């Protein structure tokens, strides 16, 4: 069947270079030649035990542009499952009798992998599990990098912000390290630096990386600038405010950038990317959010349909 | 059956002898690997005289042959220990533990937000890097910790 | 038309032996030969004025496996109708202009029957109304009993737990008493015993029943063991803990059970059924939760479609 | 000699031998009264033949005299156990367990609202032989429970 | 030094007849001649970890009438304690570092007795610990019986209401069993019966008690009628409401009551004692709450003061 | 008139060596002979706009032990103030219209010093303002060092824990730098390091300090071991838990500690100091909290009283 057919999609660590290319290949075809009744008669469950409006709506719109039906929930201060009494394991054992696939987001790490041991032959797709994984965000980031740069290797990629805790930057570095020749520049406040394990991995692969202090230091050699929001709660108000003349982005800073350089951000962006950046050609975070539809369509199509010939 | 004694107790009729347990590890190995949940006669020697370690523990489980990977589950706690397999008053086999690739059940993920705490799943860790020193990665949360940290709570 | 066509489904007391068999007959056919575009163009409303994720998702998946569309809500600390000002009666009078059928769950008893007087010719299906009725749970319990035992009469049924307040055990005893020759064993903490009215009814029908103190006393003659969760809030912590060596179930206790004996539970099960029971052949509560899809499909098909020939 | 019995068992010179431990309570007692947290010689035997009263277990702890109070706590577990001290190669005293006044430390209040659950406290239950069972009353919450309800939890 | 000097008043079961008579003789003298400056310069902590307004306001006015200062908190309204895992052993080890007595209420049973292991020489008086004890409500009840009946022995005491979960009837039955020849009538719905361990203690002491269904059966012989509130969550709405909810006193029921009979109720009464009973001589519930001021002042005086000038 | 007469105690940085010694000599005399009526007829406001139970109960017992009345509120539990945009300048201009001193805690840094611009001649003592100061916790810490070590100079003081965000270690390092020849050992995980502005102030004053990773490296030389709680939100769960969470003291670590060494902790301690340390002579954290009563009574005496009779 296709290699991912009826497979669980829990961690980037579990998908090979080739699995990532198969998804990106499919998603470029679903973008080009849409197939609206592909999952006709499927019911997907959207179990968001942790609310996330933006990720929830992108998944559900993905389920619906391929014709699937949707049942599910979100839970900020509401609706009963998991309770305290009800285990996750029994929620899943019950729900995997109703549906054909489960997309779930949960606050404790590995909640998705636990689900896998209780869903029977029902595939579960991880939409976030605490501070561990978020594969469908890495899948759309790579689609946007491939779609803008034309390739996924020999890229000069800069990552900026909270590198210690952005789960998306941890994932995107493992993923871009399955391809060849990428150079990484990590511009972070040293209180929020890339953890030694990403770095120790990068060294065994022989991947080149460097740590910088301002985007201004690398603006010129860079192809992707991946901005991350810096999280004030893990900072002191006064620490947050005293870093240099910051690590926020304004169009003045872009006068230097290459013609094909794009700025990516998983969103929300509160203040690290100013409104004037939005009008330059380098701004690509909204387009990045729309490619989420095509990456998540692709993963759903490959998981639920055996042989997909589009 | 033959002489026993206690400075180095003697001869069971077929079964396993885990000799050269460090010291105070014997009861841990009994508790953790629940070796006691058997109707067979077990004999155990705690804090015993020995050549090099000086004082050691030993466990003799008759009629059970625990092997190949059971012996490896022991490596984190009793790495220098020998597992003599006995048939008819003769040691027809001596094993030593080697580091396994998976240690199930016995450990506790130190990460408090791990889902494994609250649920009917067994703990499981991928193991790596022999004797310069061991990292364990949770199956579930995929956090890697130093074995000495998992081995405290 | 079919007998239930366009009928309100409010209480088990209102459905004859024959109506219960017609539902169970249909539901076994919809299980076998699915009919995905049967309610094409119907909009069903899922008004859960009282949240219940597990019952809500089973109904909505039922609506969707027959092709229906769904609008509705759930209300723990949220979304405005009923308010205090807005009567239920006006919520329903308004909603019965929009939809073709209403499934509703509400906290006060008889909320469903009140709805009936305001919905015009729109059928309303009760998904729970306080401590009164929950017909679609009794409908799937009987489908699971019929499907496992092969029959609905001459059964040795044991019910365990909070018999005074489990609404499901009150309903299931009225329902199994329309069929012939059933023997009931009621194992409850005497503070939580079957109320005299179920018992007084059972006696007029001449149905045999007995009250026991431990499942161990009847394990051997029993066909269905229907476990109920005992509710700690109506107990003292210390009362709850001092009952015998309890009324919880473990596989050790099952070494005695007949080969075709199954353990049912409406769920959630917090601690009265231990995890080891789940791996025995006698465990049937997850399968029971999946048959909810087929019982609720059946009721919806018969209510909204005139003559159903499948 | 040989009607196997012992097979040259560990006649200890001075110490406590707990014998006729009813089977499977043997390991329980080691855990609960933390009898292995000692550096002296212990030799344990589990699922030994009780040609007289069941099948049994037996702990021999050297140069250790476990008495009076210590012996009586074992009543709830191994009511049928004879402790025997030894000072120079044979029995100096042979003591049976009797139910104590109070059972401290080892036992958990059944009552989940009892404060003892979350705090740096040690359990104490007052023991009352209520002619059929033993009722154990918690010091803290003052709730009284069958010894059977307490002994699982 | 008086026997209670520097004792912890944690359970009724710990006070002997003599301790109960001493407290009641001291309350009688402070009621007759005030001692407004007796605890001058003492500072007492009023820790209500669970809020109970009625009991707080009386315990603190009692402290204020003997001249002491009060510091303290009411909570279950998140006044920042238990914040970042602080244990109760640690809170009490810090509060006893600067107050002269601790008065505390707490939701878990056992908590005042644990405070005792940490307080050193500062006495701990318990104002309620979960469903376990409340000595100070029993001392004021006893004082009110003594003062209106002239004795604490040979009484005919009827206990009406929820006897199964009412913490105060259980303690008063154990205090009155300290005394001679009292006779008990228990009038409770079947679900709220006086528990067997109370009944067994009474039998073992040769004290006479009996069950009745109507206060009419017993009015004539009764000296103290201690009513309790049923909380309607202990039953269900229809149970409460049913033939069960007539454990309620009206003026017409007191027709044949002895001239000395008194009606006592810990409070809040919501509807078990009708409002027309208040205008009768027999209504003594408010006067019972005024007597809480002298039972608590006497306990505070005997505990902090080694010798009293009577 | 004494130097502190009618001063505002807002920052440690404002008190000179002489001011710190005066307060500490007055605490010593009130600890030895009480003055229970010294602030008689004074009314003090205890305004905790942010709740802090431990500090409130001690500040008010201190006011009560010198004979003053207390009025006031604990909040962040919506006790109706800041209601309809009332500014803090306006709240203090009304509260100083009738109390004799204001004691206040507030979540924003700077707030006690602003109260000072509005209070007139009523002194403002700060009980904590955001992450800025807390003089009264430093005064009680200093008092406890003096009283157990006999001096405030030539000490070997180790500071263990979260040194980056712990408001109290930052103030005590600045107070001890007022004095002579103290030596500092800082033992903190890398992420919770003592900030550079503290380190730079120490270097500029020629005071000796050093970083260590294990308390074992330094135990032998240490006179005061001031431990702090790490809050696990400052790190992530796995960071905390990792090889980082061994900044925790057990009894076995104090083996080689000088006979005079003391362990001090502002509290709540949750698990950084194990419970077996309490039974050692070196555990002085509770006695440190009792010393908060005399450091605060001395500040209230010196501020409200122009001449003291020592
Ligand atoms: N029927 C037997 C035979 C031997 N043993 C045990 O087998 C263990 C080790 O086997 P052996 O090779 O006979 O003695 P060692 O040479 O000491 O083995 P090693 O050098 O590996 O310790 C000894 O502890 C001995 O008690 C036993 O209990 N029962
Ligand atoms: N030097 C010795 C002497 C005796 N024992 C132990 O002490 C126990 C005491 O039993 P004993 O009085 O010698 O004869 P029993 O009849 O077995 O005692 P009981 O009546 O309880 O069965 C025996 O199990 C034996 O192993 C020992 O280990 N070392
Ligand atoms: Zn984990
Ligand atoms: Zn208890």
Q: Within this chain, do residues E99 and E173 fall inside the same structural domain, yes or no?
A: no
Q: Within this chain, do residues F243 and F254 fall inside the same structural domain, yes or no?
A: yes
Which residues lie below 8 Å from residue F97, measured CB to CB, with a gap of 6+? none
Q: Which residue of C has its CA nearest to E238?
A: C131
Give the phi and the psi of residue D42 in degrees, each rounded to 5.
-120, 150
From the list A42, A56, A65, A105, the catalytic residue is A105
End-to-end CA distance of chain E: 13
Nearest to B6 by CA among E143, F288, D7, A160: D7
Residue to substitute from B129, B135, B140, interface A, most A β-carbons within 10 A: B140
Rounded to an integer, what distance in angstroms lies between the CA atom of residue E148 and that of residue E284? 9
Min distance C175 CA to chain D CA atoms (Å): 37
Number of domains in chain E: 2
Q: Decide: B117 and B107 in contact? Cβ < 8 Å.
A: no
Q: Decide: E124 and E8 in contact? Cβ < 8 Å.
A: yes
Token pair belonging to E273: 């004692």
The structure tokens 């912590």 sit at C237
Distance from Cα A204 to the centre of ligand 3, integer Å: 25
Q: Within this chain, do residues E20 and E110 fall inside the same structural domain, yes or no?
A: yes
Rounded to an integer, what distance in angstroms lies between the CA atom of residue C278 and that of residue C264? 11
Nearest to B75 by CA among B100, B107, B92: B100
Distance from Cα C242 to the centre of ligand 4, integer Å: 12
Q: Within this chain, do residues D86 and D119 fall inside the same structural domain, yes or no?
A: no
Rounded to an integer, what distance in angstroms lies between the CA atom of residue B131 and that of residue C80? 64
Q: Within this chain, do residues B62 and B13 fall inside the same structural domain, yes or no?
A: yes
Q: Within this chain, do residues D56 and D117 fall inside the same structural domain, yes or no?
A: no
With respect to residue D1, please indicate whether it lies within any of the assigned structural domains.
Answer: no
Q: Is E55 a catalytic residue?
A: yes
Contact yes or no for A11 and B120 at CB 8 A: no
Helix, strand or coil, per DSSP, at residue C27: helix
Q: Reduce the secondary structure of chain A to three states and give it as a string.
A: CCCCCCCCECCHHHCCHHHHHHHHHHHHHHHHCCCCCCCCCCEEEEEECCCCHHHHHHHHHHHHHCCCEEEEEECCCCCCCCCCCCCHHHHHHHHCCCCCEEEEEECCCCHHHHHHCCCCCCCEEEEEECCCECHHHHHHHHHHHHHHHCCCCCCEEEEECCCCCCHHHHHHHHHHCCCCCCEEEEECCHHHCCCHHHHHHHHHCCCEEEEECCHHHCHHHCCEEEECCCCHHHCCHHHHHHCCCCCCECHHHHCCCCCCCEEECCCCCCCCECCCHHHCCCECHHHHHHHHHHHHHHHHHHHHCCCCCC
From the list F17, F40, F54, F151, the catalytic residue is F54
Which residues lie below 8 Å from residue D115, measured CB to CB, with a gap of 6+? D121, D140, D141, E88, E106, E108, E109, E110, E111, E114, E129
Kindly state if the Cβ of B4 falls inside 6 Å of ligand 1: no
Q: Within this chain, do residues D15 and D58 fall inside the same structural domain, yes or no?
A: yes
List residues of E whose CB lies inside 8 A of any D CB: 11, 13, 87-89, 106-111, 113-114, 117, 129-133, 197
- Elucidated via: X-ray
Q: Within this chain, do residues F33 and F149 fall inside the same structural domain, yes or no?
A: no
> Please, which residues bridge with residue A46 across strands?
A72, A103
Q: Within this chain, do residues B94 and B105 fall inside the same structural domain, yes or no?
A: no
Distance from Cα D34 to the centre of ligand 4, integer Å: 23
In Å, what is the CA distance from C151 to each residue of C147, C172, C175?
A: 8, 15, 13
Q: Reduce the secondary structure of chain F to three states and give it as a string.
A: CCCCCCCCECCHHHCCHHHHHHHHHHHHHHHHCCCCCCCCCCEEEEEECCCCHHHHHHHHHHHHCCCCEEEEEECCCCCCCCCCCCCHHHHHHHHCCCCCCEEEEECCCCHHHHHCCCCCCCCEEEEEECCCCCHHHHHHHHHHHHHHHCCCCCCEEEEECCCCCCHHHHHHHHHHCCCCCCEEEEECCHHHCCCHHHHHHHHHCCCEEEECCCHHHCHHHCCEEEECCCCCCCCCHHHHHCHHHCCCECHHHHHHCCCCCEEECCCCCCCCECCCCCCCCCECHHHHHHHHHHHHHHHHHHHHCCCCCC
Q: Within this chain, do residues E190 and E274 fall inside the same structural domain, yes or no?
A: yes
Kindly state if the Cβ of B66 falls inside 6 Å of ligand 1: no
Q: Decide: D106 and D73 in contact? Cβ < 8 Å.
A: yes
Q: Within this chain, do residues F153 and F116 fall inside the same structural domain, yes or no?
A: no
Q: Within this chain, do residues B111 and B93 fall inside the same structural domain, yes or no?
A: no
For the sheet with B42-49, list strands across it.
B90-95, B82-87, B15-21, B55-62, B42-49, D42-50, D54-62, D15-21, D82-88, D90-95
Q: Within this chain, do residues A32 and A95 fall inside the same structural domain, yes or no?
A: yes
Q: Within this chain, do residues F180 and F254 fall inside the same structural domain, yes or no?
A: yes
Packed helices E53-64 and E285-304: angle between N→C axes, nearest 10 degrees? 50
Kindly state if the Cβ of B94 falls inside 6 Å of ligand 1: yes
User: Which atom number of ligand 1 is nearest to the Cα of residue B60?
Assistant: 28
Rg, C-alpha atoms of chain C: 20
Nearest to A160 by CA among A216, A88, A207, A120: A216
Pocket test for ligand 1, best of B14, B44, B59, B91 (most atoms within 8 A of CB): B91
Which residues lie below 8 Å from residue D43, measured CB to CB, with a gap of 6+? B6, B9, B43, B44, B45, B46, D10, D12, D59, D60
- Please check whether residue B112 touches F, CB under 8 A: yes
Number of domains in chain B: 2
Rounded to an integer, what distance in angstroms lies between the CA atom of residue C145 and that of residue C138? 10
Token pair belonging to E27: 């309350």
DSSP E195: P
Q: Within this chain, do residues A159 and A32 fall inside the same structural domain, yes or no?
A: no
Give the phi and the psi of residue F102 in degrees, each rounded to 5.
-115, 135
Kindly state if the Cβ of B102 falls inside 6 Å of ligand 1: no
Pocket test for ligand 1, best of B19, B58, B97 (most atoms within 8 A of CB): B19
Contact yes or no for B139 and A110 at CB 8 A: yes
User: Which atom number of ligand 1 is nearest to the Cα of residue B19?
Assistant: 24
Domain boundary among B100, B118, B138: B100
Mark whether E and B touch (3+ CB pairs within 8 Å): no
Nearest to C144 by CA among C46, C246, C277, C290: C290
With respect to residue B45, please indicate whether it lies within any of the assigned structural domains.
Answer: yes
> Please, which residues bridge with residue E136 across strands?
none
Kindly state if the Cβ of D52 falls inside 6 Å of ligand 2: no
Q: Within this chain, do residues E211 and E70 fall inside the same structural domain, yes or no?
A: no
Q: Decide: A166 and A184 in contact? Cβ < 8 Å.
A: no
Contact yes or no for B149 and F243 at CB 8 A: yes
- Please check whether residue C196 touches E, CB under 8 A: no
- Which B-chain residues 44-83 have CB contacts (< 8 A) with chain D? 44-48, 55
- Please check whether residue F276 touches A, CB under 8 A: no
Rounded to an integer, what distance in angstroms lies between the CA atom of residue A131 and that of residue C137? 39
Kindly state if the Cβ of D90 falls inside 6 Å of ligand 2: yes
Domain boundary among D82, D100, D118: D100
Q: Which residues of E249-267 are buried (b: 16+ CB within 10 A; e: fewer)?
A: bebebbeebeeebbbbbbe
Q: Within this chain, do residues C190 and C79 fall inside the same structural domain, yes or no?
A: no
Q: Would you call B38 exposed, middle or buried from its count of C-beta atoms within 10 A (0-12, 13-18, 19+)?
A: middle
Give the structural domain span for E197.
134-291
D46 in a known ligand binding site: no
Q: Is F296 a catalytic residue?
A: no
Q: Which residue of D has its CA nearest to C236?
A: D111
Contact yes or no for B145 and F242 at CB 8 A: yes
Nearest to A59 by CA among A286, A241, A298: A298
Q: Within this chain, do residues B15 and B37 fall inside the same structural domain, yes or no?
A: yes
Q: Is F64 a catalytic residue?
A: no
Show residues of chain E in contact with D146, CB under 8 Å: none
Q: Within this chain, do residues B106 and B87 fall inside the same structural domain, yes or no?
A: no
Min distance A196 CA to chain F CA atoms (Å): 12
* Residues counted in chain F: 310
Min distance B119 CA to chain A CA atoms (Å): 7
Question: How many Cα atoms occupy the beta-carbon half-sphere of D141 within 13 Å?
Answer: 23
Domain at B136, CATH number: 2.30.30.20
Rounded to an integer, what distance in angstroms lies between the CA atom of residue E46 and that of residue E49? 9
Q: Would you call D84 exposed, middle or buried from its count of C-beta atoms within 10 A (0-12, 13-18, 19+)?
A: middle
Rounded to an integer, what distance in angstroms lies between the CA atom of residue A215 and that of residue A247? 7
Kindly state if the Cβ of B89 falls inside 6 Å of ligand 1: yes
- Please check whether residue F268 touches E, CB under 8 A: yes
Query: Beta-carbon neighbour count of residue C191 at 10 Å?
Result: 18
Q: Within this chain, do residues A159 and A256 fall inside the same structural domain, yes or no?
A: yes
Rounded to an integer, what distance in angstroms lies between the CA atom of residue A178 and that of residue A138? 13
Helix, strand or coil, per DSSP, at residue B136: strand
Which residues lie below 8 Å from residue A23, measured CB to CB, with a gap of 6+? A4, A15, A139, A295, A298, A299, A302
Displacement of CA F261 from its chain's centroid (Å): 20
With respect to residue D18, please indicate whether it lies within any of the assigned structural domains.
Answer: yes
* Residue C93, H or E segment: helix C88-95
With respect to residue B2, please indicate whether it lies within any of the assigned structural domains.
Answer: no
Rounded to an integer, what distance in angstroms lies between the CA atom of residue A18 and that of residue A33? 22
Domain boundary among D100, D128, D143: D100
With respect to residue B3, please indicate whether it lies within any of the assigned structural domains.
Answer: no
B109 in a known ligand binding site: yes
* Residue C174, H or E segment: helix C167-176
Q: Decide: A146 and A152 in contact? Cβ < 8 Å.
A: yes
Q: Within this chain, do residues D130 and D78 fall inside the same structural domain, yes or no?
A: no
Give the structural domain span for B134.
101-153
Helices (H), chain B: 25-32, 69-73, 147-150
Domain at E170, CATH number: 3.40.50.1370
Residue to substitute from E43, E70, E103, interface F, most F β-carbons within 10 A: E43
From the list E8, E42, E106, E134, the catalytic residue is E134
């Amino acid at each position: 069947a296709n290699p991912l057919y009826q497979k669980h999609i829990i961690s980037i660590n579990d998908l090979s270079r080739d699995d990532l290319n198969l998804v990106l290949a499919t998603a470029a075809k679903l973008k080009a030649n849409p197939q609206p009744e592909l999952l006709k008669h499927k019911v997907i469950a959207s179990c968001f035990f942790e609310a996330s409006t933006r990720t929830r709506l992108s998944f559900e719109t993905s389920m619906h542009r391929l014709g699937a039906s949707v049942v599910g929930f979100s839970d900020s201060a509401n609706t009963s499952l998991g309770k305290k009494g009800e285990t996750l394991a029994d929620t899943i054992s019950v729900i995997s009798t109703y549906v054909d696939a489960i997309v779930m987001r949960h606050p404790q790490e590995g909640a998705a992998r636990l689900a896998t041991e209780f869903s029977g032959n029902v595939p579960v797709l991880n939409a976030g599990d605490g501070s561990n994984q978020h594969p469908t965000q890495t899948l759309l980031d790579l689609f946007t990098i491939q779609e803008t740069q034309g390739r996924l290797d020999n890229l000069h990629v800069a990552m900026v912000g909270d590198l210690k805790y952005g789960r998306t930057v941890h994932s995107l570095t493992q993923a871009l390290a399955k391809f060849d020749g990428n150079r990484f520049y990590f511009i972070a406040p040293d209180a929020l630096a890339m953890p030694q394990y990403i770095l120790d991995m990068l060294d065994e692969k022989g991947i080149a990386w460097s740590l910088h202090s301002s985007i201004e230091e690398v603006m010129a050699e860079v192809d992707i600038l991946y901005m991350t929001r810096v999280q004030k709660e893990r900072l002191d108000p006064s620490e947050y405010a005293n870093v240099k003349a910051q690590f926020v982005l304004r169009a003045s800073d872009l006068h230097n950038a290459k013609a094909n350089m794009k700025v990516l951000h998983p969103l929300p962006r509160v203040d690290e990317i100013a409104t004037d950046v939005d009008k330059t050609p380098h701004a690509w975070y909204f387009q990045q959010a729309g490619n989420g539809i095509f990456a998540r369509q692709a993963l759903l199509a490959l998981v639920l349909n055996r042989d997909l010939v589009l | 059956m033959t002489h026993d004694n206690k400075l180095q107790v003697e001869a069971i009729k077929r079964g396993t002898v885990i000799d050269h347990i460090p010291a105070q590890i014997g009861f841990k190995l009994l508790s953790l690997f629940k070796l006691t949940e058997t109707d067979q006669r077990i004999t155990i020697g705690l804090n015993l005289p020995s050549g090099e370690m000086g004082r050691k523990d030993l466990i003799k489980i008759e009629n059970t042959f625990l092997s190949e990977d059971q012996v490896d589950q022991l490596a984190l706690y009793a790495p220098q220990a020998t597992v003599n397999r006995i048939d008819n008053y003769e040691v027809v086999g001596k094993s030593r533990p080697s580091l396994p690739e998976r240690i199930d059940n016995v450990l506790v993920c130190p990460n408090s937000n791990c889902i494994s705490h609250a649920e009917p799943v067994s703990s499981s860790f991928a193991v790596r890097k022999r004797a310069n020193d061991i990292a364990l990665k949770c199956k579930y949360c995929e956090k890697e910790f130093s074995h000495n940290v998992v081995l405290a709570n």
